[PDB]
Amino acid sequence: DKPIYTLQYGNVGFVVNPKTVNQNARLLMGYEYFTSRTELVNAGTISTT
């Protein structure tokens, strides 16, 4: 309902505060987002002679 879109890099973060950490401990993040780098002007047709 409120997507994170934050215009600077580390402005919103996700926090885990662990209480017991083993040796090869890691967080496996998985994201899901919208992004847009391109614009999409209108296309071309054939018109066979």
Partner 1 sequence: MALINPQFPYAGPVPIPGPAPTETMPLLNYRVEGRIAGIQQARQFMPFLQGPHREVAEQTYYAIGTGIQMGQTFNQPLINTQEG
* DSSP category for residue 23: T
Distance from C-alpha of 33 to C-alpha of 21, rounded to nearest angstrom: 30
Rule CB under 8 A: choose which of 28, 43, 47, 49 binds partner 1.
43
Nearest approach in angstroms of CB 26 to partner 1 is 28
Amino acid in the structure at residue 45: T
> Do 12 and 6 meet the contact criterion of CB atoms below 8 Å apart?
yes
String of contacts with partner 1 for each residue 1-40, x by CB under 8 A: ------xxx--------------------------xxxxx
- Residues forming contacts to partner 1 in the complex (CB under 8 A) are 7-9, 36-46
